[PDB]
């Protein structure tokens, strides 16, 4: 019975908890599996970046609205103002978020600048090799897999 | 040191794979060194033994004896050599088995497949 010093005990162990104990002996195995999947994916989509470019958005609530973080995708207005069709955006690694909107010019201008920097660093290969078309590039020889965060970090 | 993920150093597994080996696998397990003259002639270090091969015993109480291999008892990993026997109680002579690793081959029972095995193993005829 209770007679010692300290907090009154609270332990939630009245169900058959030993039946559902989850151990982590596979933690290094999972880490190796996930790294190998990334390496396998990177070699498959090369020279495309492994990560797609993402917008910068302000987190909600007063606890985090002083910060900046990656969002899901660029708004339709942001893509419009950067001269990118929404159907073309996905074909060149630009995610589209139809749900997010631009309530202020600052959010719009910040992400339009991210797209413009992405497009200026982007090398689009022609659909038919050796027959460059509009919107493509003619110096595809120096194409390599590079990190988007190396070019467009979240500031 | 081994490094392959496909190689097991488990004593339990190695012993199970050795004593449970099938007949054709036990043939490679029962290999003997070639003699010095034969190594140079055929550029081959060792071969699976065969019936009608000529060997000399290199270890044990029968060291220095020579003869044909009369039979390859693979179920026991043993060679039976001609005139290598011991006396039973009743006077009958019982053959004495010798491990293939404990003999050296001095003359090969060469034949079409054996000749093919020498060339495949990188050797010469």
């Amino acid at each position: 019975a209770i007679h010692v010093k300290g907090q009154l005990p609270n332990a939630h162990f009245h169900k058959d908890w030993q039946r559902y104990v989850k151990t982590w002996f596979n933690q290094p195995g999972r880490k190796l599996r996930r790294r190998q999947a990334r390496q396998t994916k990177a070699a498959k989509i090369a020279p495309r970046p492994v990560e797609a470019i993402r917008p910068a958005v302000k987190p909600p609530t007063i606890r985090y609205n002083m910060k900046v973080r990656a969002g899901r995708g660029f708004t339709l207005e942001e893509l419009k103002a950067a001269g990118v069709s929404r159907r073309v955006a996905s074909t060149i690694g630009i995610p589209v978020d139809h749900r997010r909107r631009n309530r202020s010019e600052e959010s719009l201008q910040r992400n339009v600048e991210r797209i413009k920097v992405y497009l200026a660093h982007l090398i689009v290969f022609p659909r038919k090799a050796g027959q460059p078309k509009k919107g493509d590039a003619t110096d595809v020889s120096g194409a390599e897999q590079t990190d988007v965060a190396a070019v467009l970090p979240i500031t | 040191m081994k490094f392959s993920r496909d190689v097991t150093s488990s004593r339990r597994k190695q012993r199970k794979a050795h004593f449970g080996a099938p007949s054709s696998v036990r043939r490679v397990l029962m290999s003997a060194p070639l003699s010095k003259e034969l190594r140079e002639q055929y550029k081959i270090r060792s071969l699976p033994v065969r019936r009608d091969d000529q060997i000399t015993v290199i270890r044990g109480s029968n060291k220095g004896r020579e003869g044909k291999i009369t039979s390859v008892y693979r179920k026991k990993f043993l060679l039976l050599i001609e005139r290598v026997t011991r006396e039973k109680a009743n006077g009958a002579s019982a053959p004495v088995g010798i491990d293939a690793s404990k003999v050296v081959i001095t003359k090969l029972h060469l034949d079409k497949d054996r000749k093919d095995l020498i060339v495949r193993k990188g050797g010469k005829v």
């Binding site: 030993q18 151990t23 | 004593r11």
Partner: protein, 260 residues
């Protein structure tokens, strides 16, 4: 851990009092030796062990990163002390210098013969011979569990770049080779004992300051890391006790032993 079902897979029940038998559960039925025998208890043959072992026992132990780095720093400092190498069993009587640092050409060795010849030239090979002579069959049931042979530890070879040095040295008994950027306490203090004999390549030795830093300058390869300070500035306390500044103010020594 034992199997969670071990000792549980029976229908046994206590037969209660009045049968002149202990009240432990017993197998029902008939026709077999098992019938009527006691079951389940930690004291019963083919029962369940007391407190069966579980997989969720705590196997791993966390150490604070700074203490781990302290430990490795101490272990590396001990490797610079010839008395500790000798005390830890390393046959270093003939080596020219401690720390022992060899040219970067060793990083490009291709053959075990070259590695062996280098060890003989710097008189480190007697440590390897010690390892070879010490090899034995393990005492006990570990030899049944893939732990057949035991032997002493030889020199630890620490490099900066691997241009073949790892493959040239690895087959030599007792020798371990490690990149300077991943120093391991299990190798630097084997068994928990300080003073591992270490052979550094020039580039590895020249990277130690960037690896560890100093007490006042941050390590380049360990963000915000500084070497620890000691609690005593001069550890030669015998010198301090017998120093002029101390001996000139003490009282008269007094008798070490007195007559009865």
């Amino acid at each position: 851990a034992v199997s969670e079902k071990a000792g549980h897979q029976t229908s046994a029940e206590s037969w209660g009092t009045g049968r002149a038998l202990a009240r432990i559960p017993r197998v029902g039925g008939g026709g077999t030796h098992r019938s009527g025998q006691a079951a389940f208890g930690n004291m019963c043959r083919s029962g369940r062990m007391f407190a069966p072992t579980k997989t969720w026992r705590k196997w791993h132990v966390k150490v604070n990163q700074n203490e781990k780095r302290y430990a490795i720093s101490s272990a590396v400092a001990a490797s610079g002390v010839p008395s500790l190498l000798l005390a830890r069993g390393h046959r270093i009587e003939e080596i020219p210098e401690v720390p022992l640092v060899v040219d970067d050409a060793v990083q490009s060795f291709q053959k075990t013969k070259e590695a062996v010849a280098l060890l003989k030239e710097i008189k480190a090979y007697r440590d390897v011979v010690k390892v070879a002579n010490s090899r034995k069959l393990r005492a006990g049931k570990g030899k049944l569990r893939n732990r057949r042979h035991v032997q002493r530890r030889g020199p630890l070879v620490v490099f900066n770049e691997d241009a073949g040095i790892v493959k040239a040295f690895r087959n030599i008994p007792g020798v371990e080779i490690v990149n300077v950027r991943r120093l391991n306490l299990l190798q630097l203090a084997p068994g928990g004992h300080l003073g591992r004999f270490v052979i550094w390549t020039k580039s590895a030795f020249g990277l130690l300051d960037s690896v560890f830093g100093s007490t006042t300058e941050a390590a380049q390869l360990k963000k915000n890391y500084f070497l620890p300070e000691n609690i005593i500035s001069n550890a030669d306390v015998t010198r301090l006790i017998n120093s002029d500044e101390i001996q000139s103010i003490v009282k008269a020594a007094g008798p070490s032993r007195v007559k009865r």
